[PDB]
Design a protein around this nucleic acid. Structure first.
Ligand code: GTP
Ligand code: MG
Ligand code: MG
Ligand code: MG
Ligand code: MG
Ligand code: MG
Ligand code: MG
Ligand code: MG
Ligand code: MG
Ligand code: MG
Ligand code: MG
Ligand code: MG
Ligand code: MG
Ligand code: MG
Ligand code: MG
Ligand code: MG
Ligand code: MG
Ligand code: MG
Ligand code: MG
Ligand code: MG
Ligand code: MG
Lengths: 511, 212
RNA sequence: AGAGGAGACAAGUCGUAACAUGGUAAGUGUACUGGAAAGUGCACUUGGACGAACC
RNA sequence: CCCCACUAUGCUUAGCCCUAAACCUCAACAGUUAAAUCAACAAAACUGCUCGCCAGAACACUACGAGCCACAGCUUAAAACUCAAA
RNA sequence: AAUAGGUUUGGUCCUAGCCUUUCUAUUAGCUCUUAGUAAGAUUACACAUGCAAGCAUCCCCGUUCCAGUGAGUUCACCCUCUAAAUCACCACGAUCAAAAGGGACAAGCAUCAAGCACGCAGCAAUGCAGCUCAAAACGCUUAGCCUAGCCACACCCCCACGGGAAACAGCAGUGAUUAACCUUUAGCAAUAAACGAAAGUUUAACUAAGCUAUACUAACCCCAGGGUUGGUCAAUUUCGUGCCAGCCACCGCGGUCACAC
């Protein structure tokens, strides 16, 4: 098939290059003050207005100090891809460390992968932090390293001015320039479905100027740009390089992090078609292999996922894929999607006896009533770790009960008798209780020099021609089993035990 | 085939009619005007631009009648627009006045008069329209004789007009076809077509009223 | 939802009820009976035959 | 199936039940044998008029509904799944 | 169903069903160069946003129209009577057309056969006991129709004082849903409507554009794909497969020499 793909333009000519604003991404560990620092820079407060005070989305804001594009990456271990995406699209990384953690190390690794300058922000103020970072290849100027370290206090707004000065100086040193003309090149930061504006994508422009009516393609998707808005929702008539923008008009929802390229006209579709064909071919090859492998031969939790944005859905799916307890319980992902819980999700859950998990999405009264009618369980969460805990609870519920065996008593056989009762010969074991006590209700097991011979309950417990339920220590008792095949010797042992069912918890750990 | 009765429709119609009749707005409420914004607060609708200056300068009919005995019965009232448009005496001779008692200044209501437009009086009195307009003036008692003084100019008006070309040709052809040989030009009688000027007062009785 | 029925799938099992006078002619109604096709009584039908001079 | 014995039953009276291969599987009435007689077999082919019925097989003299002195019943009587036949 | 054809069987004749051949529409697969024109959510489920009703010397008039949808459904047609409206004003009338009265008016089901007051007389009091129906009453289900267009609805409670609640079945657009998916264009220059005495103003009506092989028309120096090839039905060489993989609208093919994969 002819190659109709739309490819990225060659690197811009030096004459066409024009200076642009810098893209700075704030990365770090959970509760290291990234959101608070961004709030202080933005002159607005949004850390307080959050569900649990956790940043669960990657947002881009155009701050005017000069102008910078700040990207707030989540600090949680769940949204690793999100952080990576920021590293892929950023020009400068502000690594915020509270006065080094796992996610800080991961963000450092992402920045090294992206080959991007790093500015250290010692929040909550330091020398110990720099000395530790020496191990992680982050060397401060005090230690002869290029990385600039700035101690700051985001809560009190201390030393932030010098932090901004260092960011501006590093941006000037980088000399970030791009072509503000020609076909548009950009990257998707997020994609979601607004009930009023359709499929919307938060993107960052890397090259060219985006305008209303521009035809864009991203992955298997394409759009005719209908509305370009900012973080506040106001329409913007142009999108210069290094400018966040919410673009509406996508015929299909692009995956987060996919490149966006402008094309000449809608009959774009061909390009999309070609890409689809390519993907099909790849899948087809895999299919062929599997099919050939077949032809040469010749406790199930099903979960629906509905998230507000594709990035959160991807993070949840990555968490799900880290499931390793398939032996005890099998976790099947029936369907994942973006948007509020809908009729198709309810039907899918009902069909497979699954459970719907809704991350930052709603469910109307009609949907809830339908789910109640069909026996579907919708579980709406606003925090990712709450959803993880709920999924773990469901998995544990699917797990069978674990029987705990507690020893109750022990008796040693002394003699074997044959009693003729009801025309039947019953073998009776005369046993002396050594430690503990024996109870009729509690189960018993037979031990022969350490080997386990029988497991069950006595058919008749009798002492001194009288039936007694509990024999104390040192009491003789004749024991008769329900199994006639069991042979009683002179030196056999009997161990009594009580069995209690206990709740079993999933062995899978999200970390 | 028998339609099921719709009782609630008639009930709601009667309720609406009763509410409209009881809660009907008054003239002062309807025609109040905010001279700062030139809008009527009853409905919040701006008056047209060309009237603005008049609204800022002239006065309403009742605004003048309220300061006369028996609300000016028998007096003569004219309009500024008539004074600016026509030179002949145009005015109304009051015969009955119904002021709006709900107005604090009693500067609203209906009025009836005999119209004398361009020197021609009317055989009967009738309701005066455009009372609420900011266009009226009062003829002084000492100036009534001088102002009404008017000598009727002769009505030297045309009698007949030529037919339109195609119609004239068709009529002549019909004449010839029917056998008529008369050469008299067909003419159109315009004497019965009395061309009243566009500012001649209309029948206020048939005019509607704003809803509440 | 435990079950019943029909059809398909078509196995294996128990018989051989129908098609030849199918080895007790077949069938209808109805009643009783039976592991099962089915059997028998009563009346009816030929969608059976009686070999077509006498012998 | 063959033989023996006996009962319901076959009979009478008074009510029910209302079904048959209730078939001469050939509707009632009037008429024709003229022809273009006529798929086959059967008990020749038809015409006029009217009523009743029929519309692939099986599901199905079935289910449900309704009516009945009928209560394992009778009458009316479907549909879904299936087949390319019957 | 026709100029008919294949298919019951060891075979023939008859009856009969099913399918084929033809013409459209929608969707799907594969494919697709241009121009003109026509047509264009699956959904009476929910709607972000922007616009869609003004005019005008004030009163009035219009926003009851146009535009939309097909939920509901014998309010549509004919006759009689006569409202509102136009003919400036009466027209001592014409045109147009409500309400009211009479008649006509979709499909399936009779396993929907009885409805249960469905009639008449009298000025009234009141009296008679009738009225509809197997020539389909009553009832259930389905459906916009008889297309220069007409009927119905306008978020639901048939209505809409009121209540539920805060309404795109106006245009552009979106969520959900479906196999089904047009631009968040411009102008009032043409016509139509509203207003004005008028110059004129307004109009998502409309006009002129945008997207789409859904259709028709036309063309291209270069530019062609899709399906089919046992019979019906136009058209197969060689390999591999070996009743397996697979194909078929019907009859059917495939078990080592496959015109059927
Ligand atoms: N002592 C001190 N505390 C601070 C300072 N700045 C911020 N904090 C606190 O630290 C917390 C930081 O957590 P977040 O606001 O969620 O910011 P974050 O590091 O991006 O955390 P995530 O969004 O979950 O990744 C805030 O709740 C502040 O109360 C500071 O300068 N000094
Ligand atoms: Mg934070
Ligand atoms: Mg036999
Ligand atoms: Mg026999
Ligand atoms: Mg018999
Ligand atoms: Mg017997
Ligand atoms: Mg016997
Ligand atoms: Mg006898
Ligand atoms: Mg008989
Ligand atoms: Mg029977
Ligand atoms: Mg029966
Ligand atoms: Mg029954
Ligand atoms: Mg519909
Ligand atoms: Mg029934
Ligand atoms: Mg309908
Ligand atoms: Mg609606
Ligand atoms: Mg309504
Ligand atoms: Mg619309
Ligand atoms: Mg949509
Ligand atoms: Mg379509
Ligand atoms: Mg006019």
């Amino acid at each position: 098939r002819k190659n109709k793909d739309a490819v990225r333009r060659p690197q811009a000519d030096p004459a066409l290059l024009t200076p642009r604003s810098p893209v700075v991404t704030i990365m770090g560990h959970v509760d290291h003050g990234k959101t608070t620092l961004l709030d202080k820079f933005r002159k607005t407060q949004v850390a307080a207005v959050e569900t649990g005070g956790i940043t669960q989305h990657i947002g881009a804001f155009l701050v005017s100090l000069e102008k910078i594009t700040f990207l707030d990456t989540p600090g949680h271990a769940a949204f690793s891809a999100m952080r990576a995406r920021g590293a892929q699209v950023t020009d400068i990384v502000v690594l915020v460390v509270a006065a080094v953690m796992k996610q800080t190390v991961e963000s450092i690794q992402h920045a090294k992968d992206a080959q991007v300058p790093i500015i250290l922000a010692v929040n909550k103020c330091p020398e110990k932090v720099k000395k530790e970072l020496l191990a992680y290849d982050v060397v401060c100027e005090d230690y002869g390293g290029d990385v600039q370290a700035v101690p700051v206090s985001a809560l009190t707004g201390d030393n932030l001015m010098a932090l901004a000065e260092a960011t501006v100086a590093l941006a000037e040193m980088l000399e970030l320039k791009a072509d503000p003309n020609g076909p548009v090149e950009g990257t998707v930061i997020e994609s979601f479905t607004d009930k009023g504006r359709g499929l919307v994508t938060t993107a960052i422009i890397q090259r060219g100027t985006l305008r209303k009516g521009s035809v864009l393609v991203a992955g298997k998707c394409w759009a005719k740009v209908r509305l370009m808005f900012d973080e506040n929702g106001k329409t913007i008539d142009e999108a210069y390089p290094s400018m966040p923008v919410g673009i509406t008009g996508w015929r299909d929802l692009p995956s987060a992090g996919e490149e966006i390229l402008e094309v000449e006209s809608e009959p774009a579709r061909e390009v999309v078609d070609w890409r689809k064909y390519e993907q099909e071919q790849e899948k087809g090859q895999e299919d062929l292999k599997i099919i050939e492998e077949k032809r040469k031969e010749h406790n199930v939790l099903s979960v629906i996922i509905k998230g507000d944005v594709d990035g959160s859905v991807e993070a949840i799916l990555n968490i799900i894929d880290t499931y390793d307890a398939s032996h005890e319980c099998e976790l099947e992902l029936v369907h994942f999607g973006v948007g509020d819980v809908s009729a198709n999700d309810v039907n899918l859950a009902e069909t497979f006896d699954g459970v719907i998990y809704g991350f930052n999405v709603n469910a109307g009264n009609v949907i809830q009533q339908s789910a109640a009618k069909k026996g579907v369980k919708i579980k709406l969460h606003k925090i990712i770790y709450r959803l993880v805990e709920d999924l773990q609870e469901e998995l544990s519920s699917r797990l069978p009960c674990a029987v705990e065996e507690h020893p109750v008593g022990e008796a040693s056989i002394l003699a074997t008798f044959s009693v003729t009762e009801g025309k039947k010969k019953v073998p009776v074991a005369g046993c002396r209780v050594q430690k503990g006590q024996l109870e009729k209700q509690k189960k018993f097991k037979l031990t022969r020099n350490g080997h386990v011979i029988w497991k069950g309950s006595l058919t008749s417990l009798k002492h001194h021609k009288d039936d007694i339920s509990i024999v104390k220590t040192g009491m003789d008792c004749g024991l008769s089993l329900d199994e006639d095949n069991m042979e009683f010797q002179v030196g056999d042992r009997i161990v009594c035990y009580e069995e209690k069912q206990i709740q079993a918890k999933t062995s899978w750990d999200p970390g | 085939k028998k339609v099921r009765p719709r009782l609630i429709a008639e009930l709601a119609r009667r309720v609406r009619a009763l509410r409209e009749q009881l809660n009907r707005p008054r003239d002062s409420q309807l025609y109040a005007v905010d001279y700062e914004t030139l809008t009527r607060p009853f409905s919040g609708r701006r008056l047209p631009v060309r009237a603005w200056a008049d609204v800022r300068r002239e006065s309403r009919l009742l605004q003048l009648l309220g300061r006369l005995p028996l609300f000016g019965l028998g007096r003569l009232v004219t309009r500024k627009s008539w004074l600016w448009q026509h030179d002949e005496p145009c005015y109304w001779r009051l015969t009955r006045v119904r002021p709006d008692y709900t107005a604090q200044n009693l500067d609203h209501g209906k009025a009836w008069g005999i119209l004398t437009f361009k020197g021609k009086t009317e055989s009967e009195a009738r309701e005066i329209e455009h009372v609420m307009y900011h266009d009226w003036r009062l003829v002084p008692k000492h100036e009534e004789e001088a102002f009404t003084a008017f000598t009727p100019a002769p009505e030297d008006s045309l009698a007949s007009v030529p037919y339109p070309p195609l119609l004239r040709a068709m009529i002549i052809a019909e004449r010839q076809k029917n056998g008529d040989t008369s050469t008299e030009e067909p003419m159109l009688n315009v004497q019965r077509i009395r061309m009243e000027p566009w500012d001649y007062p209309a029948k206020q009785e048939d005019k509607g009223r704003a809803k509440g």
